[PDB]
Design a protein around this nucleic acid. Structure first.
Ligand SMILES: Nc1ncnc2c1ncn2[C@H]1C[C@H](O)[C@@H](COP(=O)(O)OP(=O)(O)OP(=O)(O)O)O1
Ligand SMILES: OC[C@H]1O[C@@](CO)(O[C@H]2O[C@H](CO)[C@@H](O)[C@H](O)[C@H]2O)[C@@H](O)[C@@H]1O
Ligand SMILES: [Mg+2]
Ligand SMILES: [Mg+2]
Lengths: 555, 412
DNA sequence: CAGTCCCTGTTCGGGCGCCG
DNA sequence: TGGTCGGCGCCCGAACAGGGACTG
């Protein structure tokens, strides 16, 4: 008979499914030594129990060395058991950010000893754990073992531990309403405005409370003294920063190289302002082998150069003062790249970040700024539960012109203009009404679905006409082409009549950037005009100019 | 000690698993206070990760309320119970409700907390409360009684509800009463003072039964429609007639009697857009006849109770929004316009949120259903802000469209 | 009156970074 | 040796949805 410590969580298998069976790994003898000592130790505690072959379940096992330690970590591959185990609802809804933390007079960071192994597994479910122990030779069989406690590598371990930990914690928290406990897995962050002696009294008293349920906090990983190490950050009394990031130095970069690099630079950009990954990511698009070597363009190299130089100087963020306002400032970095700073006192940042996402085939800077504002707002609500005031490099009238005229609902929360260039503006404006005395170009284009051959042309009230043959095109592409022709061949003011809804939809959203080079050229011309009026008529209605140009391009 | 009506999901269908979205500090504080009293009262109790189901939760303030109200987004659960309410216990819809000079809406959701909930069903009402900066993991709950905003709560409570209603219904036999979700719609043709007075008497009836009531006053007879309208001009430019022909051509998908031939005749050449074109007598009459046809009703448009309602909205600008409700394309059961709503000339999302609310309400009153909205907004924009402006206890279904306006058919 | 083809936009799972 | 679990973030590409225009 074993013993029971804290309330368990019922865990059924998925219905009509049975426990895991799969043979063990060819484990090297060097690894085999580590497990045998630990597994025997567990049985004395009651974490593990021996099973007679009446238990017909086998699942592989392995182990990895604990990082920054001599100890080894003991992992049971449960991939097939996960597949057949009931689904849970994860209770870990995100990661705590240091910029969320308020300033605390006294802070303690303490870790739980053997976190998953102190939490009882479900009694009925215990049978499915079974795994076969290994020996130095293949002669000695090795004992069969069933966990009595949560095991690493199960898909139910994190949620059960987090839910169990919160239940244990809650009574203490109710007792001490003014203590802050950040609970992330087994790592506990405890902060109070109590003076250091009184704070340690609560800290030890909290240690007693966890002990009652069999949770042990060793002194070995108890941090009485700053700077604390927490969630990959270094915490100081008034400031914080990321734990140092090493960027590989390789002279020749593979594909896997750039991925690690990129992923580090994204981690860095939460505090280091102005990190840019655009050109480094350009190297990863449409590549086959993770192993493949790839040369760096002079763009990804220059980028990487200024990225490394930003890391040269140490930077730090501060903590959150609920009394003062939250402020987000955004700068345009070019090529659909945006960075932002969130702060309360000028030049003392809580955190930074970047928004580089290219959304849409045709877009403009105003749309991208709106996207970045939304990403910042959601991020802020997670960390602080409120929306920052915004400082934006866009004139109040530019924004007013965009949002009032756009056909989609769009909005930015409370914000003010900051005059830091490059300012965001609309490059061109379509006229609301036809331009008096400007030439009217009726434009159309057509193309043959089979040949991919087509014509683009215009007719005008002055009698000007053009038709151009095109090869390897589409109806859509020729309708754009027709418009491009009218813009090229017209004066500074022009009325254009198209029946292409496709083209009219692209152009009316005032794009300044496109994946299509043809649209970029249309943009180029629109910017050079003084006045453009675009109008739409239905095709095949025998209307005016449109009918005549329709005949020309159809031919 | 009451029998719990057993409840089942639609066949071959699994419970809702929907991630909780981030909440503001005020909403999290409001929910934590609401839930804690609810747990102590036994309405909800804490649960654990074994329950694989989750539905999103947040809080709202009703119009002028100033008091936080817990709102659960049960849209996914409700669709998975969709057969249960419609097939078996659905409330009938009083076609007379829309005709009443005044209709008041009451929040009777609190009553549902009386009746308990099938022990086997409670696993599907699971909702997680988030923490600021993820200080704590999610605090999960589930419902022990009939949850507000679920579609089973009015249906199961209907047997209890009618008995409480029955005295008042007999004392005022011409007052129409309808139940949609957490709300009670009470219409009458009385004068304003009598109406509000009669409303209090209904509140007392609920009070003696022990249900607290915290109401919106509608006027469905005031409600009007927004027909398609053709401009009125002294002179007509080529552009003017081009705009007119395209509008009419699109309108002909709705009223098949529209003719453009005599108006197209004016456009024969290749002319400058600003050139003035006198209208011929034949075009004047063709344009006259069309203006009449657009006053007329469309042929064979009627509501089909089996089909879903679809609502489309267009942003006309300057605080003006147009909508159409339909079931089949081009057969519109109602078309309308809103103007000078809250947030006009400053906030598009607030205005769109208001419009969605107004349209849904109209559809409840008229057809007893909520439509599926096609929203003229980017998905990321709507999801960021909509909960900030939501003042209603239901949540319709929506999707997101981007259709730029080739023609201003609905609004001049 | 279907059936395609364009073209666009969304979703989802893969890799990596980071936390236990 | 190569190998487990959950969470969040980015950037990618592929697979899927759907809306117009045009083809018979
Ligand atoms: N690489 C991993 N794979 C699976 N589970 C992990 C892994 N790393 C951490 N965990 C889980 C299991 C641990 O019980 C829990 C806490 O991690 P951790 O504290 O580093 O180990 P530990 O608490 O069991 O030993 P110790 O207390 O000595 O550090 O999170
Ligand atoms: O807005 C779409 C978005 O909402 C979610 C969660 O809120 O789904 C909900 O809304 C849908 C649209 O009305 C419903 O169909 C769905 O049942 C409901 O969960 C997300 O799933 C979705 O991405
Ligand atoms: Mg530990
Ligand atoms: Mg054409």
């Amino acid at each position: 008979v074993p013993i029971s410590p804290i309330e368990t969580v019922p865990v059924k298998l998925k219905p009509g499914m049975d426990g895991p069976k799969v043979k063990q790994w060819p484990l090297t003898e060097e690894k085999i030594k580590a497990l045998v000592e630990i597994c025997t130790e567990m049985e004395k505690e009651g974490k593990i129990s021996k099973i007679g072959p009446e238990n017909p379940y086998n699942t592989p096992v392995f182990a990895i060395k604990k990082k920054d330690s001599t100890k080894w970590r003991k992992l049971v591959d449960f991939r097939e058991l996960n597949k057949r185990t009931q689904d849970f609802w994860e209770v870990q809804l995100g990661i705590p950010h240091p910029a969320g933390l308020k300033k605390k007079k006294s802070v303690t960071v303490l870790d739980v000893g053997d976190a998953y192994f102190s939490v009882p597994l479900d009694e009925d479910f215990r049978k499915y754990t079974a795994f076969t122990i290994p020996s130095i030779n293949n002669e000695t069989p090795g004992i069969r073992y069933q966990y009595n406690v949560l095991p690493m590598g199960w898909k139910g371990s994190p949620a059960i531990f987090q839910s169990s930990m919160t239940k244990i914690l809650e009574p203490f928290k109710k007792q001490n309403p003014d203590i802050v406990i950040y609970q992330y897995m087994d790592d506990l962050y405890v902060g109070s405005d109590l003076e250091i002696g009184q704070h340690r009294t609560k800290i030890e008293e909290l240690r007693q409370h966890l002990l009652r349920w069999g949770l042990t906090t060793p002194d070995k990983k108890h941090q009485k003294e700053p700077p604390f190490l927490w969630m990959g950050y270094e915490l100081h009394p008034d400031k914080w920063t990321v734990q140092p990031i090493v960027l590989p130095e390789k002279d020749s970069w593979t594909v896997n190289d750039i991925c690690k690099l990129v992923g580090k630079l994204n981690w860095a950009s939460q505090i280091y302002p102005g990190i840019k990954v655009r050109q480094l990511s350009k190297l990863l698009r449409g590549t086959k082998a993770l192993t493949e070597v790839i040369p760096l363009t002079e763009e990804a190299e220059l980028e990487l150069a200024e990225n490394r130089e930003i890391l040269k100087e140490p930077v730090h963020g501060v903590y959150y003062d609920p009394s003062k306002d939250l402020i987000a400032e955004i700068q345009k970095q070019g090529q659909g790249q945006w960075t932002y700073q969130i702060y309360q006192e000028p030049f003392k940042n809580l955190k930074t970040g970047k928004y580089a996402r290219m959304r849409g085939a045709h877009t403009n800077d105003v749309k991208q700024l709106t996207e970045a504002v939304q990403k910042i707002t959601t991020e802020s609500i997670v960390i602080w539960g409120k929306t920052p005031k915004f400082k934006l490099p866009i004139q109040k009238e530019t924004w007013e012109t965009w949002w009032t005229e756009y056909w989609q609902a769009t909005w930015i929360p409370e914000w003010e203009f900051v005059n830091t260039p490059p300012l965001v503006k609309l490059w061109y404006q379509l006229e609301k009404e036809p331009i008096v005395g400007a030439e009217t170009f009726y434009v159309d284009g057509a193309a043959n679905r089979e040949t991919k051959l087509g014509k683009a042309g215009y007719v005008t009230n002055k009698g000007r006409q053009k038709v151009v043959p095109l090869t390897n095109t589409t109806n859509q592409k020729t309708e754009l082409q027709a418009i491009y022709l009218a813009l090229q061949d017209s004066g500074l003011e022009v009325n254009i009549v198209t029946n292409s809804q496709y083209a009219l939809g692209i152009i009316q959203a005032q794009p300044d950037k496109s994946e299509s080079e043809l649209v970029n050229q249309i943009i180029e011309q629109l910017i050079k005009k003084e006045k453009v009026y675009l109008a739409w008529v239905p095709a095949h209605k025998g209307i005016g100019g449109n009918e005549q140009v329709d005949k020309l391009v159809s031919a | 000690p009451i029998e719990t009506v057993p409840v089942k999901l639609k066949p071959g269908m699994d419970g809702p698993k929907v991630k909780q979205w981030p909440l503001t500090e005020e909403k999290i504080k409001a929910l934590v206070e609401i839930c804690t009293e609810m747990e102590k009262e036994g309405k909800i109790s804490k649960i654990g990760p074994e329950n694989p189901y989750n539905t999103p939760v947040f809080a709202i303030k009703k119009k002028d309320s100033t008091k936080w109200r817990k709102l659960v987004d049960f849209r996914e659960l409700n669709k998975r119970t969709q057969d249960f309410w419609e097939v078996q216990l659905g409330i009938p819809h009083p076609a007379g409700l829309k005709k009443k000079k005044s209709v008041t809406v009451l929040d009777v959701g609190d009553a549902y907390f009386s009746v308990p909930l099938d022990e086997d069903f409670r696993k599907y009402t699971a909702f997680t409360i988030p923490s600021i900066n993820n200080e704590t993991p999610g605090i999960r709950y589930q419902y022990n009684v009939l949850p507000q905003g679920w579609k089973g709560s009015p249906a199961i409570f209907q047997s209890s509800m009618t008995k409480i209603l029955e005295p008042f219904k007999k004392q005022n036999p011409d007052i129409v009463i309808y139940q949609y979700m957490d709300d009670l719609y009470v219409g009458s043709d009385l004068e304003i003072g009598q109406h509000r007075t009669k409303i209090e008497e209904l509140r007392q009836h609920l009070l003696r039964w022990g249900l607290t009531t915290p109401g919106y006053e509608l006027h469905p007879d005031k409600w009007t429609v927004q027909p398609i309208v053709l401009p009125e001009k002294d002179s007509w430019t080529v552009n003017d007639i081009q705009k007119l022909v395209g509008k009419l051509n699109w309108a002909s998908q709705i009223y098949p009697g529209i003719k453009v031939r005599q108006l197209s005749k004016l456009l024969r050449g290749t002319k400058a857009l600003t050139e003035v074109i006198p209208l011929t007598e034949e075009a004047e009459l063709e344009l006259a006849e069309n203006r009449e046809i657009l006053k007329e009703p469309v042929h064979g448009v009627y509501y089909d109770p089996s089909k879903d309602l679809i609502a489309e909205i267009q942003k006309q600008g300057q605080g003006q929004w147009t909508y159409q409700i339909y079931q089949e394309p081009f057969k519109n059961l109602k078309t309308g316009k809103y103007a000078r709503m809250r947030g006009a000339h400053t906030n598009d999302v607030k205005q769109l949120t208001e419009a969605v609310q107004k349209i849904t309400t109209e559809s409840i009153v008229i057809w007893g259903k909520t439509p599926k909205f096609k929203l003229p907004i980017q998905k990321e924009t709507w999801e960021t802000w909509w909960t900030e402006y939501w003042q209603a206890t239901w949540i319709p279904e929506w999707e997101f469209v981007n259709t730029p306006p080739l023609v201003k058919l609905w609004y001049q």
